[PDB]
């Protein structure tokens, strides 16, 4: 039911187990791993200490045996991250990615993670 996380940067987080498809709809960890690399400069810059967790919880969501669904981030965390990191993307010609639209997440804990 609940496969371990083969993706490198999400490794020693709060949680160590996942279940595809993720909150982007993709079925393969190798895909998520690829789509995470695009954010490495953003992580390097440190616009938000919650960015790594937030991104991991989206692309490689928490799986527990007790729950049937993948557990992503609470909208609140997303908002906080977006507030800190969206300006960094805009100054370089980009925007907040659609796949990270805070509307597609539950507000507070529907169950979700709120932080580390
Ligand atoms: C996903 C967020 C991206 C963060 C914003 C990008 C930051 C700097 C962009 C500089 C682009 C130049 C890349 C250098 C190319 C090279 O060194 O070969
Ligand atoms: C992560 O998984 C290991 C086993 O793979 C487990 O022992 C550990 O409790 C998990 N993490 C946390 C925070 O419990
Ligand atoms: C976020 O989701 C809402 C609700 O579906 C949608 O109206 C909105 O267009 C999405 N975000 C963007 C930037 O389009």
mmCIF file of C-alpha atoms and ligand atoms in Angstrom:
data_model
loop_
_atom_site.group_PDB
_atom_site.id
_atom_site.type_symbol
_atom_site.label_atom_id
_atom_site.label_comp_id
_atom_site.label_asym_id
_atom_site.label_seq_id
_atom_site.Cartn_x
_atom_site.Cartn_y
_atom_site.Cartn_z
ATOM 1 C CA UNK A 1 0.000 0.000 0.000
ATOM 2 C CA UNK A 2 2.549 2.743 1.024
ATOM 3 C CA UNK A 3 5.917 2.888 -0.940
ATOM 4 C CA UNK A 4 9.117 4.422 0.551
ATOM 5 C CA UNK A 5 10.469 7.682 -0.894
ATOM 6 C CA UNK A 6 13.244 7.212 -3.458
ATOM 7 C CA UNK A 7 13.518 10.959 -4.081
ATOM 8 C CA UNK A 8 16.632 12.418 -2.536
ATOM 9 C CA UNK A 9 15.755 15.794 -0.952
ATOM 10 C CA UNK A 10 12.461 14.674 0.651
ATOM 11 C CA UNK A 11 14.334 11.942 2.476
ATOM 12 C CA UNK A 12 14.836 12.989 6.018
ATOM 13 C CA UNK A 13 11.579 14.964 6.446
ATOM 14 C CA UNK A 14 8.706 14.580 8.908
ATOM 15 C CA UNK A 15 7.622 11.541 6.956
ATOM 16 C CA UNK A 16 9.299 8.744 4.993
ATOM 17 C CA UNK A 17 6.514 7.072 2.990
ATOM 18 C CA UNK A 18 4.472 8.091 -0.073
ATOM 19 C CA UNK A 19 1.812 7.024 -2.570
ATOM 20 C CA UNK A 20 1.361 8.031 -6.197
ATOM 21 C CA UNK A 21 -0.378 9.721 -7.943
ATOM 22 C CA UNK A 22 0.750 12.968 -6.304
ATOM 23 C CA UNK A 23 -1.172 16.264 -6.201
ATOM 24 C CA UNK A 24 0.032 17.007 -9.734
ATOM 25 C CA UNK A 25 -1.416 13.739 -11.003
ATOM 26 C CA UNK A 26 1.772 11.951 -12.002
ATOM 27 C CA UNK A 27 2.265 8.273 -11.190
ATOM 28 C CA UNK A 28 6.072 8.065 -11.105
ATOM 29 C CA UNK A 29 8.566 9.170 -8.453
ATOM 30 C CA UNK A 30 11.141 9.591 -11.199
ATOM 31 C CA UNK A 31 8.832 12.272 -12.655
ATOM 32 C CA UNK A 32 8.414 14.140 -9.395
ATOM 33 C CA UNK A 33 12.176 14.014 -8.873
ATOM 34 C CA UNK A 34 12.605 15.631 -12.281
ATOM 35 C CA UNK A 35 9.973 18.300 -11.686
ATOM 36 C CA UNK A 36 11.525 19.170 -8.310
ATOM 37 C CA UNK A 37 14.905 20.032 -9.829
ATOM 38 C CA UNK A 38 13.452 23.088 -11.512
ATOM 39 C CA UNK A 39 12.998 24.597 -8.021
ATOM 40 C CA UNK A 40 16.581 24.111 -6.760
ATOM 41 C CA UNK A 41 17.641 27.735 -7.352
ATOM 42 C CA UNK A 42 14.537 28.846 -5.459
ATOM 43 C CA UNK A 43 15.476 26.558 -2.554
ATOM 44 C CA UNK A 44 19.110 27.713 -2.661
ATOM 45 C CA UNK A 45 18.053 31.331 -2.295
ATOM 46 C CA UNK A 46 16.071 30.686 0.883
ATOM 47 C CA UNK A 47 12.977 32.805 0.364
ATOM 48 C CA UNK A 48 11.115 30.404 2.679
ATOM 49 C CA UNK A 49 12.222 27.741 5.173
ATOM 50 C CA UNK A 50 8.996 25.841 4.428
ATOM 51 C CA UNK A 51 9.601 25.635 0.686
ATOM 52 C CA UNK A 52 11.288 22.231 0.650
ATOM 53 C CA UNK A 53 8.628 20.611 2.847
ATOM 54 C CA UNK A 54 5.815 22.303 0.942
ATOM 55 C CA UNK A 55 7.194 21.147 -2.445
ATOM 56 C CA UNK A 56 7.867 17.603 -1.172
ATOM 57 C CA UNK A 57 4.362 17.352 0.326
ATOM 58 C CA UNK A 58 2.976 18.232 -3.106
ATOM 59 C CA UNK A 59 5.089 16.087 -5.428
ATOM 60 C CA UNK A 60 5.706 13.187 -3.048
ATOM 61 C CA UNK A 61 2.761 13.389 -0.574
ATOM 62 C CA UNK A 62 2.544 11.638 2.812
ATOM 63 C CA UNK A 63 1.064 8.158 2.844
ATOM 64 C CA UNK A 64 -0.068 6.393 5.981
ATOM 65 C CA UNK A 65 -1.668 2.954 6.150
ATOM 66 C CA UNK A 66 -4.670 4.370 8.016
ATOM 67 C CA UNK A 67 -5.648 6.796 5.239
ATOM 68 C CA UNK A 68 -6.766 6.001 1.682
ATOM 69 C CA UNK A 69 -5.685 9.320 0.139
ATOM 70 C CA UNK A 70 -2.309 11.054 -0.316
ATOM 71 C CA UNK A 71 -1.772 13.768 2.281
ATOM 72 C CA UNK A 72 -0.600 17.093 0.869
ATOM 73 C CA UNK A 73 -0.105 20.560 2.394
ATOM 74 C CA UNK A 74 -2.619 22.806 4.113
ATOM 75 C CA UNK A 75 -3.591 25.883 2.095
ATOM 76 C CA UNK A 76 -2.254 28.048 4.906
ATOM 77 C CA UNK A 77 1.288 26.784 4.469
ATOM 78 C CA UNK A 78 0.998 27.232 0.711
ATOM 79 C CA UNK A 79 -0.121 30.835 1.216
ATOM 80 C CA UNK A 80 2.823 31.548 3.511
ATOM 81 C CA UNK A 81 5.278 30.018 1.061
ATOM 82 C CA UNK A 82 3.697 31.796 -1.914
ATOM 83 C CA UNK A 83 3.895 35.111 -0.045
ATOM 84 C CA UNK A 84 7.634 34.693 0.487
ATOM 85 C CA UNK A 85 8.690 33.013 -2.765
ATOM 86 C CA UNK A 86 6.372 34.270 -5.531
ATOM 87 C CA UNK A 87 8.124 37.653 -5.614
ATOM 88 C CA UNK A 88 11.381 35.834 -6.340
ATOM 89 C CA UNK A 89 9.819 34.183 -9.389
ATOM 90 C CA UNK A 90 8.259 37.404 -10.689
ATOM 91 C CA UNK A 91 11.480 39.377 -10.572
ATOM 92 C CA UNK A 92 12.882 36.762 -12.988
ATOM 93 C CA UNK A 93 9.951 36.737 -15.372
ATOM 94 C CA UNK A 94 8.055 33.813 -13.866
ATOM 95 C CA UNK A 95 4.894 33.399 -11.818
ATOM 96 C CA UNK A 96 3.449 31.137 -9.141
ATOM 97 C CA UNK A 97 3.063 27.817 -10.973
ATOM 98 C CA UNK A 98 -0.523 26.724 -11.565
ATOM 99 C CA UNK A 99 0.256 23.295 -10.152
ATOM 100 C CA UNK A 100 0.857 25.069 -6.819
ATOM 101 C CA UNK A 101 -2.373 27.107 -6.741
ATOM 102 C CA UNK A 102 -3.287 27.331 -3.051
ATOM 103 C CA UNK A 103 -6.974 26.885 -3.969
ATOM 104 C CA UNK A 104 -6.378 23.188 -4.708
ATOM 105 C CA UNK A 105 -5.405 22.519 -1.098
ATOM 106 C CA UNK A 106 -7.583 22.312 2.061
ATOM 107 C CA UNK A 107 -7.356 25.343 4.384
ATOM 108 C CA UNK A 108 -6.226 24.091 7.828
ATOM 109 C CA UNK A 109 -6.532 20.350 8.778
ATOM 110 C CA UNK A 110 -10.152 17.246 5.031
ATOM 111 C CA UNK A 111 -6.733 16.375 6.431
ATOM 112 C CA UNK A 112 -3.368 17.903 5.547
ATOM 113 C CA UNK A 113 0.058 18.840 6.887
ATOM 114 C CA UNK A 114 0.673 22.304 8.293
ATOM 115 C CA UNK A 115 4.439 22.456 8.750
ATOM 116 C CA UNK A 116 7.507 20.452 9.762
HETATM 117 C C1 LIG B 1 12.370 28.015 -10.317
HETATM 118 C C2 LIG B 1 12.852 29.350 -9.815
HETATM 119 C C3 LIG B 1 14.005 29.905 -10.636
HETATM 120 C C4 LIG B 1 14.703 30.964 -9.793
HETATM 121 C C5 LIG B 1 14.993 32.203 -10.617
HETATM 122 C C6 LIG B 1 16.186 31.951 -11.529
HETATM 123 C C7 LIG B 1 17.409 32.596 -10.923
HETATM 124 C C8 LIG B 1 18.409 32.952 -11.729
HETATM 125 C C9 LIG B 1 18.251 32.724 -13.213
HETATM 126 C C10 LIG B 1 19.606 32.875 -13.886
HETATM 127 C C11 LIG B 1 19.623 32.085 -15.192
HETATM 128 C C12 LIG B 1 21.041 31.926 -15.721
HETATM 129 C C13 LIG B 1 21.511 30.480 -15.598
HETATM 130 C C14 LIG B 1 23.017 30.362 -15.820
HETATM 131 C C15 LIG B 1 23.332 29.418 -16.976
HETATM 132 C C16 LIG B 1 24.691 28.789 -16.760
HETATM 133 O O1 LIG B 1 25.348 29.127 -15.744
HETATM 134 O O2 LIG B 1 25.103 27.953 -17.604
HETATM 135 C C1 LIG B 2 10.308 6.977 8.825
HETATM 136 O O1 LIG B 2 10.291 5.595 8.483
HETATM 137 C C2 LIG B 2 11.005 4.758 9.399
HETATM 138 C C3 LIG B 2 11.001 3.362 8.816
HETATM 139 O O2 LIG B 2 11.221 3.393 7.413
HETATM 140 C C4 LIG B 2 10.335 4.832 10.763
HETATM 141 O O3 LIG B 2 11.051 4.026 11.695
HETATM 142 C C5 LIG B 2 10.256 6.276 11.245
HETATM 143 O O4 LIG B 2 9.429 6.307 12.403
HETATM 144 C C6 LIG B 2 9.630 7.176 10.181
HETATM 145 N N1 LIG B 2 9.678 8.577 10.580
HETATM 146 C C7 LIG B 2 9.082 9.056 11.679
HETATM 147 C C8 LIG B 2 9.199 10.535 11.901
HETATM 148 O O5 LIG B 2 8.488 8.329 12.470
HETATM 149 C C1 LIG B 3 -6.760 28.454 -8.473
HETATM 150 O O1 LIG B 3 -7.971 27.689 -8.362
HETATM 151 C C2 LIG B 3 -9.153 28.480 -8.565
HETATM 152 C C3 LIG B 3 -10.335 27.582 -8.288
HETATM 153 O O2 LIG B 3 -10.409 26.498 -9.207
HETATM 154 C C4 LIG B 3 -9.166 29.047 -9.979
HETATM 155 O O3 LIG B 3 -10.281 29.923 -10.102
HETATM 156 C C5 LIG B 3 -7.890 29.827 -10.262
HETATM 157 O O4 LIG B 3 -7.884 30.203 -11.637
HETATM 158 C C6 LIG B 3 -6.625 29.025 -9.898
HETATM 159 N N1 LIG B 3 -5.449 29.868 -10.014
HETATM 160 C C7 LIG B 3 -5.098 30.531 -11.132
HETATM 161 C C8 LIG B 3 -3.870 31.379 -11.035
HETATM 162 O O5 LIG B 3 -5.739 30.437 -12.177
#
